[PDB]
């Protein structure tokens, strides 16, 4: 069923994730502290998001084939996908108890009001929670989770991509691996239904990306807000 190459890819992506997602959340103590300013949570959550961008870059570099892309295409894929992979990877800390992101302590536990205290409105947050709930209900194995993140990043339809055919070839291999993994665990029609819902999630992420971009542009236009961001966030999310 799963070929040696497909097992290889999954092993590599699982290891990449283990090396770039820290489930102890130990580094959160190095951020500017959460304060519960109208945007009182923006220092803390800008540091968290900027840290997460760094981890997404570290994950992306280990995706088989990502190295074969030009530096230009690597940059455009990361710039376009960073926000989506952040939304996807944050689902590992999301909890269905109170619809919040629980990072090991009450100080580092974030609800809808915390996200609104970083500047976003329910225009973004309501669909983001709906997204997190629906992804949680898929009950993905870690193997599917890491494949979805990689498929998310290596998408040939990102604006700016120069070698779309190469990007597509890389993504096709990942997509074939994920489809085969699903088939190994689930007979039809459940296999097709599950893959279909994972594809819908990637489409949802594009809409969330667009809405985040709109709200980020309006927020970062005020210098009193940009002042609270990090240099890495300004570079990656700007432009």
């Amino acid at each position: 069923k799963l070929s040696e190459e497909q097992q290889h890819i999954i092993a590599i992506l699982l290891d990449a994730h283990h090396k770039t997602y820290d489930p102890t959340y130990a580094d959160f103590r190095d951020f500017r502290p959460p304060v519960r300013s109208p945007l009182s949570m923006l220092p803390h959550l800008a540091d968290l998001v900027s840290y997460s961008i760094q981890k997404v870059i570290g994950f992306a570099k280990m995706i088989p084939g990502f190295r074969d892309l030009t530096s230009d295409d690597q940059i455009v894929l990361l710039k376009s996908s960073a926000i989506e992979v952040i939304m996807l990877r944050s689902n590992q800390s999301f909890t269905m108890d109170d619809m919040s992101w629980d990072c090991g302590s009450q100080d580092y536990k974030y609800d809808v009001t915390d996200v609104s205290k970083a500047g976003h409105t329910l225009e973004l947050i309501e669909p983001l929670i709906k997204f997190q709930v629906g992804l949680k209900k898929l009950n993905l194995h870690e193997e599917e989770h890491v494949l979805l993140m990689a498929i998310c990043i290596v998408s040939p339809d990102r604006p700016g991509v120069q070698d779309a055919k190469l990007v597509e070839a890389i993504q096709d291999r990942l997509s074939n691996t994920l489809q085969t993994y699903i088939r190994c665990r689930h007979p039809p029609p459940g296999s097709h239904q599950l893959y279909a819902k994972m594809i819908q999630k990637l489409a949802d992420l594009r809409s969330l990306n667009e809405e985040h971009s709109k709200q980020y542009r309006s927020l970062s236009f005020q210098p009193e807000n940009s002042m609270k961001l990090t240099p890495l966030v300004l570079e990656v999310f700007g432009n």
């Binding site: 760094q54 570099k61 940059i75 710039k79 570079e235 432009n239």
Partner: peptide, 12 residues
Amino acid sequence: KNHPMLMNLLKD
């Protein structure tokens, strides 16, 4: 634009 920070993180 250029992206020296992202590029630097890509070259690690």
